[PDB]
Amino acid sequence: MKILFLDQSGKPGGAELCLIDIAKPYRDRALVGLFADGAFKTLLEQHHIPVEVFTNQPSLGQLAPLVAKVVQTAHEYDLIYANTQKALVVGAIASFIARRPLVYHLHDILSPEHFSQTNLRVAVNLANRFASLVIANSQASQTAFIQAGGRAELTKVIYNGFDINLYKTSPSDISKLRQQLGVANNFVVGHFSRLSPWKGQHILIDALAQCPPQVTAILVGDALFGEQDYVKELHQQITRLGLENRVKFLGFRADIPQLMAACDLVAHTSTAPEPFGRVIVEAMLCGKPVVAAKAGGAMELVEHGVNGFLTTPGESQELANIINTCIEDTQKTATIASNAQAIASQRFDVVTINQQIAETLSSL
Amino acid sequence: MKILFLDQSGKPGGAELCLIDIAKPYRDRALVGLFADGAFKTLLEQHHIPVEVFTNQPSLGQLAPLVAKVVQTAHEYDLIYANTQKALVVGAIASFIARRPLVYHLHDILSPEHFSQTNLRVAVNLANRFASLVIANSQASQTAFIQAGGRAELTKVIYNGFDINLYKTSPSDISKLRQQLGVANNFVVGHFSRLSPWKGQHILIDALAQCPPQVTAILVGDALFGEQDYVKELHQQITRLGLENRVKFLGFRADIPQLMAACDLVAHTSTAPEPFGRVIVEAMLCGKPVVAAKAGGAMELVEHGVNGFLTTPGESQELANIINTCIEDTQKTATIASNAQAIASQRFDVVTINQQIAETLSSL
């Protein structure tokens, strides 16, 4: 089985990173076709995954040369695996023209709040008619596809997988890192995300206002071209609350597992429902208490008070109450954190996930 | 029922001319989408048929801009009617994305000799899966569709239609035209098609060499694009045979019916099977003796000795024998000519053809 993976983006978003992991086992018999050049192409090359950028530059493919290129490529492969919406449109056309089955891996919540109805109708219809299988990254994604008119019987939920041993950090690396960061005597709440209003860093900051003074926040991630007004707003907020010495912006970091290990609590505080929070799973695999916003995929990841905490999105006082619970009940909090590592290792191990994908592919 | 008609060409070939007739009854509720500009667009505008040129110039349509525009226009129509092969490719895609039924009007013989196998395999598979109906312009086109793997049960034969009264010309007009052509005392063999090796002008010319000297030929049509070497070769063969004053090249003429009426015999001498000879029917509706090459649609249009004559393609002697038969049995030849008018009026009347199209469409 040769796979032609298709993905519309040149940028490594959540779906693209997941595709690295999905594709690696097949990298001697696969090609990732991108519709844009970018950093994602480079990351695929760094991982020895063949990659090609298909463009609309000039079979009778002069009619639609992008499509015609994809079709022509597809003849050499046995299956087309579309990883994003536009890849699903093009992959659907290519699928019947080249006579190859199609899998759609749905990484989005197909909500009419975030996608135009046109795009939704087209995506749903093409999936329903041409896709042999729709892989959904969560029950939340699966339910949204169905509510939009997708055929429920086509769907199977397969969660994102992780190399679980990448998330183990020694006590002595932890202690050093907290020292260098200057947070060794603090209760450290980490937020790991790009700085964006949807990601809710301002909610953590409002909750910090309600936390004892030894509580400090580390914000890990970078700002982006589109959301400069937000970064300005965070800085002002923090100074307006008098929190300038209790919030550290670390910028973009590659050592996320280690940083997580050095936190005392990891907060996910997104204000819009997400399909699967990678960060929430990462925090759990690091053996850390995690608090998340109760929406989208998060609810399937965490059982409240068992292996993490869930709070109403956008509500800073409920988040502060969790943080305070974590300070005051040290024992319960370590047990939860230990439950989290155990359960996440069981559900989200990339070995298990890759087996599920392989079984599901041989099923067709 | 609003119809969106699709045709790849901006030039008025047989398929496009046929499309003027097909669309006329629908012109208050139709649009002809072309994939190139040209003389066919102006013609359509002269017949008050709404027309648009769709191109690949930059909704989800950045990926395939031609297809996106067709798809978006197709939303406002009820049926997509694809009149050429590239229109079937685009139309089929649009049919599925916009959720509209597709009719494919097949005007070509789908042969590997004239179309690449890839374009055949694509067109046949798209037709088979998405077309509700494949209208073939003849049994020969129908059979070639089937022989290429097209689904026989999808097909129906509907011939091209003609306004039969356009082909009536008075004897006084005929006499005056013959005098102005300088052929009043000749036996005139007319040939009406573009100059191309495929159209076999050279076969008429060789036949003329074998004919009594009162036999002259009129060649009506412009040189086919690419075929200026052919034109040279004809002029040389003519000069070589002594026929320079026995062959007239009229160039492009609109007034075909009148030129036909001034002939004493109309010859179709094509060396490759053609799906439906318009000129053969027109000659018949002119009440003229017609000789045609025995291949492709010609065989369904003429019964040999009853309403015309059929000859082995590429054989100039057999053509000469027909011409001579026409010179020597005037009475028989006039009965055949008279028969051809009656039968062509019965079979190819546009009123009847339009009724078969309407009824076929309404059965969807």
- Closest listed residue to residue A210, CA positions, set A324, A328, A308: A324
**B291 has which bridge partners?**
B267, B309
Which amino acid, A262?
A
Contact across the interface for A97 and B125, Cβ inside 8 Å:
yes
Within 8 A by CB and 6+ apart from B143, the residues are none
* B305 CB neighbour count, 10 Å cutoff: 12
Positive or negative torsion for Cα A286, A289, A292, A294: positive
Q: Which residues of A34-58 are buried (b: 16+ CB within 10 A; e: fewer)?
A: bbeeeebbebbeeeebebeebebee
| φ, ψ (nearest 5 deg) of residue A281 | -55, -40
Question: Residue A276: left if φ>0, alpha if ψ -120 to 50, beta else—which one?
Answer: beta
Residues in B closer than 8 angstroms to A57, CB to CB, are: none
Contact across the interface for A126 and B97, Cβ inside 8 Å:
yes
Q: How far is CA A129 from CA A105, A132, B121, B211, B238, in A?
A: 15, 9, 21, 64, 61
Give the integer Cα–Cα distance in Å for A208 and A223: 21
Q: What is the 3-state secondary structure (H, E, C) of chain A?
A: CCEEEEECCCCCCHHHHHHHHHHHHHCCCEEEEECCCCHHHHHHHHCCCCEEECCCCCCCHHHCHHHHHHHHHHCCCCEEEECCHHHHHHHHHHHHHHCCCEEEEECCCCCCCCCCHHHHHHHHHHHHHHCCEEEECCHHHHHHHHHCCCCHHHEEECCCCECHHHHCCCHHHHHHHHHHHCCCCCEEEEEECCCCHHHCHHHHHHHHCCCCCCEEEEEECCCCHHHHHHHHHHHHHHHHCCCCCCEEEEECCCCHHHHHHHCCEEECCCCCCCCCCHHHHHHHHCCCCEEEECCCCHHHHCCECCCEEEECCCCHHHHHHHHHHHHHCHHHHHHHHHHHHHHHHHHHEHHHHHHHHHHHHHCC
Within 8 A by CB and 6+ apart from B179, the residues are none
| φ, ψ (nearest 5 deg) of residue B255 | -80, 60
**With contact defined as beta carbons under 8 Å apart, do B36 and B90 qualify?**
no
**With contact defined as beta carbons under 8 Å apart, do B209 and B239 qualify?**
no
HSE of A56, CA atoms in CB hemisphere, 13 A: 14
Using CA coordinates, name the residue in chain A closest to B64: A64
**With contact defined as beta carbons under 8 Å apart, do B52 and B19 qualify?**
no
Tokens matching residue A82: 């579309």
- Does the CB of A54 have a partner CB in chain B at under 8 Å? no
Contact across the interface for B60 and A126, Cβ inside 8 Å:
no
Structure determined via: X-ray
Residues in A closer than 8 angstroms to B97, CB to CB, are: 122, 125-126
Residues in A closer than 8 angstroms to B35, CB to CB, are: 63
| φ, ψ (nearest 5 deg) of residue B159 | -75, 165
**Tokens 């191990």 identify what position?**
A349
Alpha carbon B36 to its chain centroid, in Å, reads 20
- Does the CB of A117 have a partner CB in chain B at under 8 Å? no
Q: How far is CA B4 from CA B24, B42, B70, B104, B351, in A?
A: 13, 18, 9, 12, 22
Give the integer Cα–Cα distance in Å for B60 and A3: 25
Residues in B closer than 8 angstroms to A85, CB to CB, are: 60
Chain A nearest C-alpha distance from B62 (Å) = 9
Alpha carbon B288 to its chain centroid, in Å, reads 18
Contact across the interface for A66 and B66, Cβ inside 8 Å:
no
Interface A-B, measured as beta-carbon pairs within 8 A, has a size of 57
The CATH number of residue A314's host domain is 3.40.50.2000
- Closest listed residue to residue A130, CA positions, set A191, A87, A164, A161: A87
- Closest listed residue to residue A189, CA positions, set A331, A314, A328, A320: A320
Q: How far is CA A310 from CA A199, B113, B350, in A?
A: 15, 69, 74
Give the integer Cα–Cα distance in Å for B65 and B88: 16
Where does chain A break, by residue before each gap (C–N > 2.5 Å)?
Answer: 58
**With contact defined as beta carbons under 8 Å apart, do A233 and A265 qualify?**
no
- Does the CB of A188 have a partner CB in chain B at under 8 Å? no
Tokens matching residue B355: 């009724």
Instruction: Compute the CA torsion angle A349, A353, A358, A363 (nearest 10 deg).
Output: 140
Burial bucket for residue A248 (CB in 10 Å: 0-12, 13-18, 19+)? middle
What domain range includes position A338?
A: 164-348
Contact across the interface for B67 and A62, Cβ inside 8 Å:
no
**A63, A86, A125 member nearest B60 (Cβ):** A86
Give the integer Cα–Cα distance in Å for B184 and B175: 7
